[PDB]
Design a protein around this ligand. Structure first.
Ligand SMILES: Nc1ncnc2c1ncn2[C@@H]1O[C@@H](CSCC[C@H](N)C(=O)O)[C@@H](O)[C@H]1O
Ligand SMILES: Nc1ncnc2c1ncn2[C@@H]1O[C@@H](CSCC[C@H](N)C(=O)O)[C@@H](O)[C@H]1O
Ligand SMILES: COc1ccc2c(=O)c(-c3ccc(O)cc3)coc2c1
Ligand SMILES: COc1ccc2c(=O)c(-c3ccc(O)cc3)coc2c1
Lengths: 345, 345
């Protein structure tokens, strides 16, 4: 109990109690297709033209205006006022326009699914579980098994992973030091082969194996140098000169990462060979990164409770590599929030 | 498509996609009883003592640390580092300590109920409804009927309304200009009589009627000058020299507010008398309020979609008063986010 610093603390508490409205209002704008409507309009759109296109009832027009102004203050639209109030895209809402260079709208829709995002109401039950991941607590099965049983969820997750894929995959194939001298590579947890296809288009003579769970690669067909193998990375990974792990390790505890890293080391050290493992994931660095960037990485780290995952700093990465028996490593920036890490057995 | 301003826009988009984590992590701290554990400890608590008291499994201790650091950066705890990392309360988390002067933890728990807060996933369906409120869309009945059928929800809502009641009610009873000369007052939507009891303790000769829905006031007993009346404010409000509306009008559309205001005007103009109506609710004022304050009011306005409610600025309030047939009004600051508005028939 202090003076009027209580009103200030109350404002902070309210901001956080209602923070979910920032997520739900953004979801609403994407579901209403507002970014694309504005892009197609070719100029800032008036409130009257917007609600005309949306065909909302007149009793809810004021509610559309209130939501638009809330999203604009957050940076997703720019309000221009003349005879009428109009709404223009911003660089942030341009990221939600279809066919734009980098479109992350599928990420908004995937993450904000009611069941998945609603799982965070159970952080208390989860913190008391010795082994279950947050999704394991709420979905009743592990996440990958869950995707296998729920096609619409699998589609949504794949579209979300695809959404920043071009950017990362092009940054990766532009890294000659990763591919120099390789004759073969296996993309572990390679999905439907998105990364591998870009790799093969770039390096036509390189053999690339897309390795993932049987249900993921079933019925997929490869072609000239690109093949698919269904398996379990905790049991056996195909031999190759190198292993790629893109967005894999941050989905697992340190104990599980050690299991995966041991199987990768085995895969690149068969028949006397001494290959390497290439990892794409975030590297937290509080002293080097710009604060804004560090804050998003820390936020992603908390979000990884979904799979008992983690976003790691350099000392955490180093400790795993050493414990898995790798002799040295190198970290390079790759693109945006991600780094390229190479580890040598 | 621009230069590296894309990475900056991506950081903004991610902040908003995952904003619900700010709400869920705050809910987690209250459910784990962390603010009270720290208060009872009497000093900043070490991570090891905290997880000892919580009895979380060792596999989740790191997750407790990650959540604590995320909440601390948000302002809910202060990290103190010595031989160990320790966590101290802040003015904002002191608002979550039981028996503290002003405790808003019940507000966090009420609002963040999964069903209620989860309703905001349906903003699109709601914006297309001519009449339904957001809660009407998701709960299948109006909110008040819903509380009548769900005791635990009614308890949670009452505890939440009670949480800032002492502060507002004491500010109200200290306003002599409101009570001077009154012989009777009816608190419309008066709940279980929380405000009326403070009014009667202050003004022992004043007659006060607590008026609310029959299920709310059933079995409640009054005493000397305080009585309870069950009814419907849209149909008939008991005559009195004045009507009090605390946190009522912001829960209704302009059309419904006009209906309530007409019934209040009738109640204070019977038998040739010319009484008044006293309203306690927010008044948005972008040019007078500090920006931080305006932002919370605008945020509460968006949140009122739950009941098709609204937080109004002075011109919006004035337009309702005039349309309801009141001749003039006066607005005064009351406490924190609230104003005291008096309207004269
Ligand atoms: N035991 C296991 N063995 C092999 N792959 C696995 C696995 N458990 C999970 N995976 C998978 O790892 C994934 C990784 S998420 C998508 C990853 C892909 N590298 C990309 O960047 O898009 C899923 O494709 C998933 O099926
Ligand atoms: N038709 C109606 N007639 C009378 N009261 C009503 C009503 N519809 C809703 N109410 C009520 O208005 C409320 C107001 S919320 C709590 C209000 C109370 N003045 C306080 O400040 O705590 C509920 O108590 C609710 O039952
Ligand atoms: C493989 O790389 C990733 C990266 C991010 C996520 C992610 O963010 C979620 C997630 C989190 C919260 C939700 O509400 C919904 C989905 C699930 O898997 C993931 C896998
Ligand atoms: C009478 O005054 C009020 C003031 C605020 C609220 C409120 O904030 C909610 C609410 C909003 C979102 C949720 O998730 C849960 C509850 C319901 O009724 C209310 C009534």
């Amino acid at each position: 109990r202090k003076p009027s610093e209580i009103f200030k603390a109350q404002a902070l508490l309210y901001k956080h109690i209602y923070a979910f409205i920032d997520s739900m209002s953004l979801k609403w704008a994407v579901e209403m297709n507002i970014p694309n409507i504005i892009q197609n309009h070719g100029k800032p759109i008036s409130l009257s033209n917007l609600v005309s296109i949306l065909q909302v009832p007149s009793s809810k027009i004021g509610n559309v205006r209130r939501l638009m102004r809330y999203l604009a203050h957050n940076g997703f639209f720019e309000i221009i006022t003349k005879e009428e109030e109009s709404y223009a895209l911003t660089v942030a809402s341009e990221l939600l326009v279809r066919g734009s260079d980098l479109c992350l709208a599928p990420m908004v829709e995937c993450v904000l699914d009611p069941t998945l995002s609603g799982s965070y109401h159970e952080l208390k039950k989860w913190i008391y579980e010795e082994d279950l991941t947050l999704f394991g607590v709420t979905l009743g099965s592990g996440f990958w098994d869950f995707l296998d049983k729920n096609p619409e969820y699998n589609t949504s997750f794949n579209d979300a992973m695809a959404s920043d894929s071009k950017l990362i995959n092009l940054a990766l194939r532009d890294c000659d030091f990763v591919f120099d001298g390789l004759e073969s590579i296996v993309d572990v947890g390679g999905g439907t082969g998105t990364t591998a296809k870009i790799i093969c288009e770039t390096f036509p003579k390189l053999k690339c194996i897309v390795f993932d769970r049987p249900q993921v690669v079933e019925n997929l067909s490869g072609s000239n140098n690109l093949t698919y193998v269904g398996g379990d990375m905790f049991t056996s990974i195909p031999n190759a000169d190198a292993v790629l792990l893109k967005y894999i390790l941050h989905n697992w505890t340190d104990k599980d990462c050690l299991r995966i890293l041991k199987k990768c080391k085995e895969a690149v050290t068969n028949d006397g060979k001494r290959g390497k493992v290439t990892i794409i994931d975030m590297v937290i660095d509080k002293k080097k990164d710009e604060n804004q960037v560090t804050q998003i990485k820390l936020l992603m780290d908390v979000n990884m409770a979904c799979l008992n995952g983690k976003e790691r700093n350099e000392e955490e990465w180093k400790k795993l590599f050493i414990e898995a028996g790798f002799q040295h490593y190198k970290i390079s920036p790759l693109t945006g929030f991600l780094s390229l890490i190479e580890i040598y057995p």
